[PDB]
Amino acid sequence: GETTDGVYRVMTRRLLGSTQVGVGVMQEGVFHTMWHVTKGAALRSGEGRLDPYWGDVKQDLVSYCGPWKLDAAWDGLSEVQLLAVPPGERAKNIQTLPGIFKTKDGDIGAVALDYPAGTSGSPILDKCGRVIGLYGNGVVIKNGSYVSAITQGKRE
Amino acid sequence: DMYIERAGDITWEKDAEVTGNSPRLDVALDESGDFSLVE
Ligand SMILES: O=C(Nc1ccc2c(c1)CNC2)c1cccc2[nH]c(=O)[nH]c12
């Protein structure tokens, strides 16, 4: 069906009314989203069907129709824009300076913006509009608020 | 069964609302892709 580049809402009719379970990026004929949004299930786009191509529960990422295409990275110094697509609310760019998730395998970018769980999959952009990662996987800090990581996949 | 709807273009917008702090958090990622705060 629709394969135009951009940001998309992932919805479901399995529950009461139409409920938004997450968000995704369509780029180069591939739909990119978080694994915890779809659980690897196939998606629909009008009459068309999107089937999973690659996925990984630890990275919490999944691509549809083809391999992961997003490869831009946070430089460690610049502000980024979370293209937040909230449930029932209009898409909105939120500029922020990212923090650091210090891990045993290296550091990762992190956006400290609290958004509903249904905002999972919203892209994080650089000053060029490139997708440097997706919002939706992080931690609950001492304040109860969510601090998501900048989750980027690998372009083989 | 899940379905998708276009929500917009991916573009950087100048003069967007600038909010949020930049914290350095010690985390651990388990085999189930879940983060946890290490203190
Ligand atoms: O729960 C969230 N994310 C999530 C859930 C389940 C799993 C994973 C990530 C990865 N492995 C399985 C979430 C995402 C965005 C904002 C939030 N606010 C809040 O309190 N939780 C979230």
From Swiss-Prot, chain A:
Top-level taxon in the UniProt lineage = Viruses
Q: How is it modified after translation?
A: Acetylated by host KAT5. Acetylation modulates NS3 RNA-binding and unwinding activities and plays an important positive role for viral replication.
According to its record, how does it sit in the membrane? Peripheral membrane protein
Can you give the residue ranges of the Peptidase S7 domain?
Answer: 1-156
The active site lies at 36, 60, 120
State the compartments where it is located: Host cytoplasm; Host endoplasmic reticulum membrane
Q: How does it assemble?
A: Forms a heterodimer with NS2B. Interacts with NS4B. Interacts with unphosphorylated RNA-directed RNA polymerase NS5; this interaction stimulates RNA-directed RNA polymerase NS5 guanylyltransferase activity. Interacts with non-structural protein 2A. Interacts with host SHFL; this interaction promotes NS3 degradation via a lysosome-dependent pathway. Interacts with host CEP63; this interaction disorganizes the centrosome and inhibits host innate immune response.
Role description: Displays three enzymatic activities: serine protease, NTPase and RNA helicase. NS3 serine protease, in association with NS2B, performs its autocleavage and cleaves the polyprotein at dibasic sites in the cytoplasm: C-prM, NS2A-NS2B, NS2B-NS3, NS3-NS4A, NS4A-2K and NS4B-NS5. NS3 RNA helicase binds RNA and unwinds dsRNA in the 3' to 5' direction. Leads to translation arrest when expressed ex vivo. Disrupts host centrosome organization in a CEP63-dependent manner to degrade host TBK1 and inhibits innate immune response. Inhibits the integrated stress response (ISR) in the infected cell.
This protein is called Serine protease NS3
Lineage of producing organism:
Viruses, Riboviria, Orthornavirae, Kitrinoviricota, Flasuviricetes
- What fragment of the whole protein does this chain represent? 1514 to 1669 of 3419
